[PDB]
Amino acid sequence: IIESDLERAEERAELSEGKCAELEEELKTVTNNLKSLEAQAEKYSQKEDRYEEEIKV
Amino acid sequence: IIESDLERAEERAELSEGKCAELEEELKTVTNNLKSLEAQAEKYSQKEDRYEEEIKV
Amino acid sequence: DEDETTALVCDNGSGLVKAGFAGDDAPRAVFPSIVGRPRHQGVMVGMGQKDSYVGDEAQSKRGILTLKYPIEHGIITNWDDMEKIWHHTFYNELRVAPEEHPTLLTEAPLNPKANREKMTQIMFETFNVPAMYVAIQAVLSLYASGRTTGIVLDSGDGVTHNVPIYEGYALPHAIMRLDLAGRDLTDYLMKILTERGYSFVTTAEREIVRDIKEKLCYVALDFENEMATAASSSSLEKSYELPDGQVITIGNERFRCPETLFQPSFIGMESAGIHETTYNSIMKCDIDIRKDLYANNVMSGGTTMYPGIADRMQKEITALAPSTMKIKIIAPPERKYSVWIGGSILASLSTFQQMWITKQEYDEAGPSIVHRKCF
Amino acid sequence: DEDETTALVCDNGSGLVKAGFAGDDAPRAVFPSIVGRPRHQGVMVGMGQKDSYVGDEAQSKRGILTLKYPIEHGIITNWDDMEKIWHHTFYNELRVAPEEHPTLLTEAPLNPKANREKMTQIMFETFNVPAMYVAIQAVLSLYASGRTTGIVLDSGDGVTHNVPIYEGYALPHAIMRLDLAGRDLTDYLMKILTERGYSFVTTAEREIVRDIKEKLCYVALDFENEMATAASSSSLEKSYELPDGQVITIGNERFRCPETLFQPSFIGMESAGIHETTYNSIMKCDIDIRKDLYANNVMSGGTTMYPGIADRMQKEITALAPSTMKIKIIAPPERKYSVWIGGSILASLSTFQQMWITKQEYDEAGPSIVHRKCF
Amino acid sequence: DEDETTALVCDNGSGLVKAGFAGDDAPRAVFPSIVGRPRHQGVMVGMGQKDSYVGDEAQSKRGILTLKYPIEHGIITNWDDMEKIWHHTFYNELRVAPEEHPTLLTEAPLNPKANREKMTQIMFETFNVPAMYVAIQAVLSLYASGRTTGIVLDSGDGVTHNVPIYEGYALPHAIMRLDLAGRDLTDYLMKILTERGYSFVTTAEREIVRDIKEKLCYVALDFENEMATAASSSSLEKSYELPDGQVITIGNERFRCPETLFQPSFIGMESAGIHETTYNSIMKCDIDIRKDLYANNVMSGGTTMYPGIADRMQKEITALAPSTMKIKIIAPPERKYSVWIGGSILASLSTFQQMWITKQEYDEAGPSIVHRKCF
């Protein structure tokens, strides 16, 4: 019974670990996108200025 | 051992669930930061476009 | 059984079959496109045992079954096996008999006639469906993706479609049927894992490698620097647990497999790969179309779930693409399930209620009717 | 090997290069305009095997080669490969040295300028030819056909040029040039045969389809009636043997491909078709020119060997032409082999000895001289 | 004993090692891949008796030894026993010192990588060989047969490789390695002979069953007709002498065992047989390759000596192949040894003297170098 609950609890660990890994992969994907977007938001803010400068010029 | 492994299987259910929940929060955090940076990068891309339109003008 | 005589929707690929009813936001069930058969002689008596197993039965009992796929790179060649998969799908998981509901099936238009003709015939003659509609995968993907314009990259198990659509119109001269798919990526991985000391040559082994690929592989936006390190260090290897408790670790091979999509020569294919094929589909469209397709490359189907794939594709296209212009990829979570989701959307549109073949028109005309009524 | 410094004539198109010497009746040898390269890793050692193959070598060893054409739509984009093709043409099969002979090359009148300039440079710098001339395809066709006045409709592998000529003079405002050619018909046939269960997407497959096209395809005189029967009965199918023993039959696809010349929309092209452009080349010329061009529709180039094409081209233009007047087509057994034949005739004319560019003027002016001296 | 500073050749399978010098047409000696060890308690003092026996020594004293094979399914795992076999092979029977001679070893391309790395390491570190080269058994078979093109079925003791080679190039995507070999046929025969009343379980008994197969077995051109009479009459039985004066008489088992080559399911393998692998190696190659591979199926190694095998294989492939096409088998008398000969040919070619890993490059890089230098 404990083993059956263990198997299910372990299954939950696996399902939850599955989700954990999936979220981790999504976390990293999103975080990697965050980072590319941090780079883009800054490059874009810089472009906001390069373009603003092209307008000023 | 089995009760201990149930406690561990359950601990792992809790740990992996706990961690996947932490990742859901980290994921939502980076997703929201991504959305913010994307919105920011997009606001800049929109400004880049406004300038591009004005650059063309 | 439902609250409306809603169409049933089944997206039957060379990999898996996704099914549910029109109007939902997900298939109710997914089955492997597999019919399994025992390769052993029975010894015990009164053991039950089927002549063939389907879908998830085929996979659960696979220890002694040979597993066959009725669909060959998008074409059903074995329709007796698809009828059994469908009966299981409709009656055991969806719990709805097609006799009371229209059914929507999907294919690439590039498919050489037999698939849409037999899909239409099976549902009208073995299931007595009151109506039928064979849909376009690019259409379904764009509805699911929130687009009317763009290129659908559906790089799934069978064939890559890469069809461009503008304002809801096909641009058919630019569609490049590509013999590079998820099934080939699996075969490549079986061979390179053999080199590492873990041979994979049987059905069970093929299913294991597909599972390894789906859980461990990624493409990488920069495969060259990734392999320079992955091929040099165990720190980039990921462990996979084999069904019998043994462990296999995979290093540069993890991405080497997905890389085939950009390096098709790995499987002996004479191709530029998916990024250049997508680029050429954009290029082949008129000059006032090209810009809208560059800005709207849309991921669908399978393999589009690999880490680094949206970035790998956008960067490769950007490298091939002209300057000034912004090249962009749309990669919705409705990935791999997007054709099914599109089926739900399309089946339910008011502007699509005249597109259905009734079980009258079908019998007066026969199965060749699919060429006049669907597309 | 000749008893005179006779010019060499090389009709270098986007298909095959026909080459021989001026004053003869026929080319000495013909070569695919191809340079081939292995797409495989060598396993056995001491097997010979080239890094690159040329012409017929490239075609004969094509089983493992990717084959590239240096000429696309009438223009050389790869002149390093053309140097190889010409080396082969001249030294391996014609076995002549251009250093001792003038050389005549051919192109369409609106072929982008880089083509004639690079052709001039290769022959003067790598072959050190004593003289050069780049000739007009329509001129060459008119000499071969015995005419000074007519429409030259040259529908070959690269482009359709369609230029009206009167009394040996261009009427350039009436050139109804069209970006529709035999190479597009080949691409269409690969796609339409893929739909019949015989996929053709690799180089070997492309060369096979071109061979299928040349032997099995036709345009017919009446498309709709031809398809009404071909689409209804197997009696109009024709078989073809593939190199590996496969047999393919083609039904209405046999003419639906070629029909794209009259209906360009079949491949996504925006065009009136070759017969309307032929008609307009006549119509856009002065009214006292039109009568002579109507009586002299000159057929040349590739695709002219499709059954029903000469009969159909006259029918299609006479149907657009005014009544009372007689409209006629000229389509001799010298069709398509008219550009080379014209090269032999032109190179040999005494009046043409004032047209040849010598390796004197060339050094002072450079290859740009072709734009001052040829046309 | 030898009169030239030539290369050495050793083809090391899971069965036997064929060794001699490059430039001959036969190994000097064949040494079984065996190291034997006594499994009984000694009782006499001063009567010699070794702790271990190597190669032919292991078989000569086998009555009280357990015999172990260092190589399994094509690769070396017991590297220590391989070094002992080689020391004996080279110094006692070939009468050479590898330190003064470059050495060629072999493997199948779809074997695990560790094999070529350990074989290379032993010769460089324990034998101090000046150079090394691990060859492809299929390459060696094509050199021995006078071919650059064909499908090679090398019939190993461990595995069967099944590789298409064209114009000296590998076509690796079409390799169909099969886990069926001479040791599996031997195991099948031990079980079938058990059904007849003769139990063979110990090393001496296992060696006998292998010997029975070698002298009594065949495949038959037509299995079902051969079994119809073999199963009905003593007229198709043959007696084998067991080394104690008793005999075993074998009937349809005589062919049912080799039949596993056409029916691998007999040993639990999921495979349609060696003719399927031959066929798919041709079929997965381009159509301009296929014609040359159909005409050049190559038999190499053992099992190729069974009555009915060359005729049966040609029949089994022509049955799957398209009509019109000529299917042909190459099966020279240099059976079971032609791969050794190929080793001799390659090792002594002038085209191969630049292919060697030297004992400079090895010392600087280590054994992983074999992966970059050999193939």
Side-chain angles (χ1 to χ4, degrees), chain D residues 38-47 49-50 61-64 202 204-205 208 241 243-246, chain E residues 136 139 142-143 147-148 165-171 286-291 322-325 346 351:
Chain D
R39 69 184 182 88
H40 288 268
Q41 172 66 55
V43 76
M44 300 186 74
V45 59
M47 298 292 104
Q49 305 302 313
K50 296 177 178 174
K61 298 291 185 179
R62 68 187 180 273
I64 58 169
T202 69
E205 290 170 349
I208 292 167
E241 180 183 348
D244 60 346
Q246 290 180 70
Chain E
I136 298 168
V139 168
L142 289 171
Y143 281 115
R147 295 291 185 274
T148 62
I165 299 171
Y166 179 82
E167 293 283 318
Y169 288 80
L171 303 172
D286 289 349
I287 66 290
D288 286 321
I289 296 171
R290 289 181 181 181
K291 74 185 199 297
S323 69
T324 302
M325 178 58 69
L346 178 58
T351 66

XYZ file of all heavy atoms in Angstrom, chain D residues 38-47 49-50 61-64 202 204-205 208 241 243-246, chain E residues 136 139 142-143 147-148 165-171 286-291 322-325 346 351:
397
model
N 30.413 15.657 -56.561
C 30.007 14.610 -55.631
C 29.380 15.165 -54.375
O 29.855 16.158 -53.822
C 31.342 13.917 -55.308
C 32.207 14.169 -56.518
C 31.835 15.564 -56.984
N 28.328 14.487 -53.910
C 27.640 14.866 -52.674
C 27.855 13.800 -51.594
O 27.137 13.752 -50.595
C 26.151 15.126 -52.907
C 25.261 13.937 -53.247
C 23.864 14.398 -53.526
N 22.936 13.296 -53.810
C 22.220 12.599 -52.878
N 22.319 12.869 -51.585
N 21.401 11.645 -53.269
N 28.838 12.935 -51.832
C 29.191 11.816 -50.961
C 30.669 11.774 -50.597
O 31.519 12.313 -51.305
C 28.799 10.479 -51.608
C 27.335 10.222 -51.642
N 26.702 9.541 -50.628
C 26.373 10.551 -52.537
C 25.404 9.474 -50.895
N 25.183 10.064 -52.056
N 30.950 11.134 -49.466
C 32.302 10.867 -48.984
C 32.871 9.605 -49.613
O 32.225 8.547 -49.572
C 32.289 10.748 -47.453
C 33.601 10.275 -46.812
C 34.756 11.231 -46.947
O 34.684 12.404 -46.570
N 35.851 10.716 -47.502
N 34.076 9.720 -50.188
C 34.735 8.580 -50.814
C 35.093 7.556 -49.753
O 35.495 7.918 -48.636
N 34.958 6.279 -50.098
C 35.265 5.204 -49.173
C 36.463 4.360 -49.644
O 37.285 3.939 -48.828
C 33.972 4.397 -48.883
C 33.556 3.476 -49.993
C 34.138 3.645 -47.673
N 36.527 4.063 -50.943
C 37.591 3.237 -51.491
C 38.713 4.174 -51.959
O 38.440 5.299 -52.391
C 37.082 2.380 -52.632
C 35.970 1.427 -52.293
S 35.518 0.333 -53.612
C 36.895 -0.834 -53.614
N 39.971 3.731 -51.912
C 41.066 4.630 -52.309
C 41.848 4.191 -53.560
O 42.326 3.055 -53.678
C 42.006 4.841 -51.092
C 42.581 3.538 -50.600
C 43.111 5.779 -51.437
N 42.041 5.140 -54.478
C 42.700 4.800 -55.735
C 41.666 4.497 -56.807
O 41.890 3.676 -57.702
N 40.517 5.152 -56.675
C 39.348 4.997 -57.530
C 39.249 6.082 -58.588
O 38.223 6.197 -59.273
C 38.128 5.167 -56.649
C 37.962 4.177 -55.562
S 37.614 2.518 -56.086
C 39.187 1.732 -55.837
N 38.145 9.389 -59.591
C 37.063 10.245 -59.067
C 37.485 11.705 -59.010
O 38.508 12.066 -58.430
C 36.533 9.780 -57.708
C 36.063 8.333 -57.709
C 34.973 8.040 -58.724
O 33.970 8.759 -58.856
N 35.188 6.962 -59.476
N 36.746 12.521 -59.734
C 37.060 13.928 -59.907
C 36.420 14.795 -58.833
O 35.489 14.375 -58.146
C 36.623 14.376 -61.291
C 37.361 13.684 -62.411
C 36.842 14.107 -63.757
C 37.623 13.440 -64.878
N 37.031 13.729 -66.194
N 27.995 10.341 -64.694
C 28.353 9.996 -63.318
C 27.383 10.573 -62.279
O 27.641 10.466 -61.065
C 29.784 10.460 -63.024
C 30.878 9.806 -63.893
C 31.070 8.305 -63.586
C 32.238 7.719 -64.380
N 32.462 6.273 -64.079
N 26.242 11.098 -62.754
C 25.241 11.809 -61.965
C 24.645 11.051 -60.801
O 24.091 11.676 -59.906
C 24.075 12.238 -62.831
C 23.220 11.114 -63.356
C 22.202 11.586 -64.315
N 21.426 10.473 -64.789
C 21.713 9.670 -65.841
N 22.772 9.894 -66.601
N 20.923 8.639 -66.093
N 24.782 9.730 -60.752
C 24.185 8.963 -59.665
C 24.555 9.514 -58.287
O 23.722 9.469 -57.389
N 25.773 10.053 -58.114
C 26.161 10.626 -56.818
C 26.571 12.090 -56.888
O 27.268 12.573 -55.985
C 27.287 9.828 -56.149
C 28.506 9.776 -57.089
C 26.758 8.495 -55.705
C 29.746 9.257 -56.454
N 15.251 15.414 -56.620
C 16.729 15.431 -56.591
C 17.282 15.684 -57.987
O 16.513 15.716 -58.951
C 17.320 14.100 -56.085
O 17.085 13.060 -57.054
C 16.653 13.721 -54.772
N 19.181 13.702 -59.919
C 19.008 12.571 -60.817
C 17.573 12.544 -61.307
O 17.295 12.349 -62.495
C 19.354 11.283 -60.098
N 16.654 12.835 -60.401
C 15.253 12.829 -60.728
C 14.893 13.929 -61.726
O 14.089 13.699 -62.634
C 14.495 12.920 -59.427
C 14.611 11.630 -58.596
C 14.090 11.724 -57.199
O 13.811 12.825 -56.765
O 13.989 10.705 -56.550
N 15.914 12.941 -65.206
C 14.967 11.958 -65.710
C 13.704 12.641 -66.189
O 13.217 12.311 -67.268
C 14.638 10.892 -64.664
C 15.888 10.059 -64.443
C 13.431 10.020 -65.132
C 15.844 9.198 -63.261
N 10.236 4.285 -69.279
C 11.141 3.477 -68.474
C 12.190 4.319 -67.770
O 12.967 5.027 -68.413
C 11.859 2.451 -69.356
C 12.847 1.546 -68.611
C 13.583 0.606 -69.511
O 13.199 0.468 -70.648
O 14.565 0.053 -69.072
N 15.705 4.590 -65.393
C 16.973 3.878 -65.287
C 17.000 2.695 -64.318
O 17.720 1.728 -64.558
C 17.913 4.986 -64.811
C 17.329 6.249 -65.386
C 15.840 6.067 -65.298
N 16.210 2.723 -63.241
C 16.238 1.626 -62.301
C 15.199 0.554 -62.580
O 15.039 -0.368 -61.780
C 16.016 2.150 -60.909
C 14.698 2.821 -60.841
O 14.142 3.094 -61.917
O 14.199 3.044 -59.758
N 14.508 0.648 -63.709
C 13.477 -0.311 -64.069
C 12.064 0.139 -63.680
O 11.095 -0.580 -63.940
N 11.908 1.310 -63.060
C 10.538 1.723 -62.744
C 9.798 2.165 -63.991
O 10.372 2.732 -64.921
C 10.456 2.881 -61.755
C 10.845 2.603 -60.367
C 10.695 3.862 -59.548
O 9.577 4.323 -59.276
N 11.817 4.430 -59.177
N 37.542 -1.056 -43.931
C 36.158 -1.433 -44.070
C 36.078 -2.778 -44.759
O 36.508 -2.911 -45.903
C 35.453 -0.378 -44.924
C 35.531 0.920 -44.222
C 34.021 -0.786 -45.262
C 35.133 2.061 -45.041
N 34.957 -2.619 -48.333
C 35.920 -2.055 -49.255
C 36.859 -3.122 -49.680
O 37.205 -3.251 -50.856
C 36.659 -0.884 -48.597
C 37.847 -0.457 -49.393
C 35.686 0.268 -48.504
N 35.164 -5.431 -52.095
C 35.103 -4.902 -53.451
C 36.481 -4.913 -54.119
O 36.589 -5.205 -55.316
C 34.474 -3.501 -53.450
C 32.962 -3.421 -53.164
C 32.573 -2.008 -52.979
C 32.154 -3.963 -54.340
N 37.566 -4.637 -53.381
C 38.852 -4.709 -54.064
C 39.129 -6.145 -54.512
O 39.525 -6.383 -55.654
C 40.028 -4.284 -53.165
C 40.278 -2.786 -52.963
C 40.133 -2.229 -51.721
C 40.688 -1.981 -54.024
C 40.381 -0.902 -51.529
C 40.940 -0.626 -53.808
C 40.779 -0.101 -52.553
O 41.030 1.230 -52.274
N 35.792 -4.844 -58.073
C 34.701 -3.888 -58.208
C 34.903 -2.601 -57.428
O 35.642 -2.554 -56.453
C 33.388 -4.501 -57.752
C 32.856 -5.660 -58.546
C 32.404 -5.212 -59.893
N 31.795 -6.265 -60.631
C 32.449 -7.171 -61.390
N 33.784 -7.162 -61.495
N 31.747 -8.087 -62.039
N 34.245 -1.539 -57.896
C 34.216 -0.257 -57.195
C 32.793 0.028 -56.712
O 32.515 1.008 -56.006
C 34.660 0.875 -58.127
O 33.736 0.973 -59.231
C 36.043 0.550 -58.671
N 28.052 0.658 -51.886
C 29.164 1.503 -52.315
C 29.033 1.775 -53.825
O 28.792 0.850 -54.603
C 30.529 0.852 -51.963
C 30.632 0.677 -50.390
C 31.724 1.672 -52.550
C 31.820 -0.139 -49.864
N 29.153 3.034 -54.243
C 29.040 3.373 -55.674
C 30.190 4.216 -56.185
O 30.474 5.283 -55.647
C 27.739 4.097 -55.911
C 27.473 4.540 -57.291
C 26.963 3.666 -58.204
C 27.715 5.835 -57.642
C 26.675 4.105 -59.453
C 27.426 6.278 -58.901
C 26.899 5.412 -59.802
O 26.587 5.821 -61.066
N 30.866 3.754 -57.237
C 32.024 4.458 -57.798
C 33.053 4.772 -56.726
O 33.683 5.824 -56.750
C 31.604 5.770 -58.485
C 30.764 5.621 -59.720
C 31.548 5.217 -60.978
O 32.643 5.737 -61.226
O 31.062 4.378 -61.696
N 33.231 3.868 -55.774
C 34.185 4.099 -54.720
C 33.676 4.965 -53.559
O 34.445 5.233 -52.628
N 32.405 5.394 -53.580
C 31.805 6.233 -52.529
C 30.858 5.495 -51.616
O 30.111 4.608 -52.037
C 31.046 7.405 -53.137
C 31.913 8.433 -53.721
C 32.455 8.271 -54.960
C 32.144 9.568 -53.024
C 33.238 9.249 -55.475
C 32.932 10.550 -53.535
C 33.485 10.389 -54.760
O 34.276 11.367 -55.293
N 30.845 5.874 -50.347
C 29.891 5.240 -49.455
C 28.541 5.879 -49.635
O 28.445 7.105 -49.800
C 30.303 5.355 -47.998
N 27.501 5.078 -49.469
C 26.149 5.577 -49.493
C 25.533 5.183 -48.140
O 24.598 4.379 -48.102
C 25.439 4.896 -50.663
C 26.109 5.083 -52.069
C 25.424 4.225 -53.026
C 26.065 6.492 -52.523
N 19.798 6.543 -54.878
C 19.180 7.207 -56.028
C 19.047 6.276 -57.218
O 19.889 5.407 -57.452
C 19.972 8.441 -56.472
C 19.884 9.619 -55.516
O 19.080 9.599 -54.613
O 20.619 10.552 -55.714
N 18.040 6.527 -58.032
C 17.741 5.687 -59.181
C 18.853 5.570 -60.232
O 18.881 4.600 -60.982
C 16.423 6.137 -59.842
C 16.519 7.554 -60.488
C 15.280 6.058 -58.834
C 16.635 8.807 -59.575
N 19.803 6.499 -60.249
C 20.914 6.416 -61.190
C 22.117 5.686 -60.579
O 23.171 5.550 -61.207
C 21.279 7.792 -61.723
C 20.287 8.328 -62.739
O 19.801 7.578 -63.548
O 20.036 9.493 -62.726
N 21.933 5.222 -59.347
C 22.874 4.415 -58.591
C 22.378 2.976 -58.627
O 23.155 2.032 -58.823
C 23.005 4.845 -57.113
C 23.571 6.236 -57.011
C 23.799 3.848 -56.357
C 23.534 6.801 -55.609
N 21.057 2.833 -58.438
C 20.387 1.549 -58.286
C 20.688 0.574 -59.392
O 20.830 -0.617 -59.130
C 18.873 1.699 -58.290
C 18.245 2.332 -57.092
C 16.770 2.390 -57.232
N 16.149 3.027 -56.096
C 14.809 3.199 -55.937
N 13.953 2.837 -56.867
N 14.342 3.725 -54.832
N 20.800 1.042 -60.626
C 21.040 0.105 -61.711
C 22.377 -0.627 -61.560
O 22.507 -1.801 -61.936
C 21.024 0.842 -63.064
C 22.264 1.723 -63.373
C 22.086 2.501 -64.675
C 23.441 3.011 -65.264
N 24.186 3.985 -64.390
N 12.194 -4.215 -59.557
C 11.354 -3.987 -60.711
C 11.758 -4.917 -61.842
O 12.887 -5.408 -61.873
C 11.622 -2.521 -61.050
C 12.995 -2.243 -60.490
C 13.085 -3.074 -59.232
N 10.830 -5.146 -62.760
C 11.062 -5.951 -63.952
C 11.952 -5.153 -64.882
O 12.313 -4.024 -64.549
C 9.750 -6.308 -64.624
O 9.151 -5.175 -65.181
N 12.419 -5.778 -65.971
C 13.336 -5.176 -66.966
C 14.781 -5.148 -66.444
O 15.708 -5.561 -67.141
C 12.894 -3.755 -67.409
O 11.577 -3.823 -67.966
C 13.836 -3.246 -68.483
N 14.955 -4.673 -65.225
C 16.237 -4.584 -64.556
C 16.904 -5.935 -64.344
O 16.257 -6.935 -64.037
C 16.037 -3.916 -63.197
C 17.287 -3.792 -62.330
S 18.626 -2.886 -63.097
C 17.959 -1.294 -63.109
N 44.558 -3.754 -50.326
C 44.568 -2.374 -49.885
C 45.868 -2.009 -49.204
O 46.494 -1.011 -49.554
C 43.384 -2.093 -48.946
C 43.297 -0.644 -48.358
C 43.232 0.343 -49.469
C 42.045 -0.486 -47.489
N 48.133 3.783 -53.555
C 47.098 4.783 -53.341
C 46.746 4.869 -51.874
O 46.157 5.843 -51.413
C 45.811 4.435 -54.140
O 45.201 3.205 -53.629
C 46.221 4.198 -55.606
